[PDB]
Design a protein around this ligand. Structure first.
Ligand SMILES: Nc1nc2c(ncn2[C@@H]2O[C@H](COP(=O)(O)OP(=O)(O)NP(=O)(O)O)[C@@H](O)[C@H]2O)c(=O)[nH]1
Ligand SMILES: [Ca+2]
Ligand SMILES: [Ca+2]
Ligand SMILES: [Ca+2]
Ligand SMILES: [Mg+2]
Ligand SMILES: [Mg+2]
Length: 166
């Protein structure tokens, strides 16, 4: 069957792991355990196609930035996550995209911009601000909550649909 290699990137604490775990295991992780690098694999049906999602959950701790080149090499599409209550994480997106761009030597790498924690009211990144960033990259912007599940399937499935346009 078709395999899609997805990679989830973004700053510390934005909810990369909680998003992936909500998608794959259908529950919310409330606690914080920093990730080094974990892999998840699950068979799903997307738009009638039975396929395998292979998802790499990466570290947001800058201390592990040296690992980024390797995972940017293998991935077919990237979920670039920030949190809507974390302006610095939004500003950090470009460093993730710029490296993805250099490593892929491409300006059309499949990606989706994700604004996570949309269940929280302490918003400092307005939807339109993120829409503008995504537009400049030529990719969709989607808001999610790993806590409530809002947008979670949408974000990952949209990334699959982006890879399919490549
Ligand atoms: N309210 C709310 N909290 C969230 C959401 N997503 C993650 N969190 C919380 O934010 C914290 C960090 O989440 P986590 O998924 O570990 O972040 P991460 O981006 O994987 N961190 P790291 O880069 O260190 O691996 C956890 O306490 C988690 O419960 C969300 O959508 N809503
Ligand atoms: Ca829980
Ligand atoms: Ca390279
Ligand atoms: Ca692009
Ligand atoms: Mg994590
Ligand atoms: Mg502002």
């Amino acid at each position: 069957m078709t395999e899609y290699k997805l990679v989830v990137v973004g700053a510390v604490g934005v909810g990369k792991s909680a998003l992936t775990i909500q998608l794959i295991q259908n529950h919310f992780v409330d606690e914080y355990d920093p990730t080094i690098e974990d892999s998840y694999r699950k068979q799903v049906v997307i738009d009638g196609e039975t396929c395998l999602l292979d998802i790499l959950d990466t570290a947001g701790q800058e201390e592990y930035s040296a690992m980024r080149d390797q995972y940017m090499r293998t991935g077919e599409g990237f979920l670039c996550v920030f949190a809507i209550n974390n302006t610095k994480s939004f500003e950090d997106i470009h460093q993730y995209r710029e490296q993805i761009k250099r490593v892929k030597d491409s300006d059309d790498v499949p990606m989706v911009l994700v604004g996570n924690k949309c269940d929280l009211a302490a918003r400092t990144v307005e939807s339109r601000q993120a829409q503008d960033l995504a537009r400049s990259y030529g990719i969709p912007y989607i808001e999610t909550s790993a806590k409530t599940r809002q947008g979670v399937e949408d974000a990952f499935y949209t990334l699959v649909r982006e890879i399919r346009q490549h």
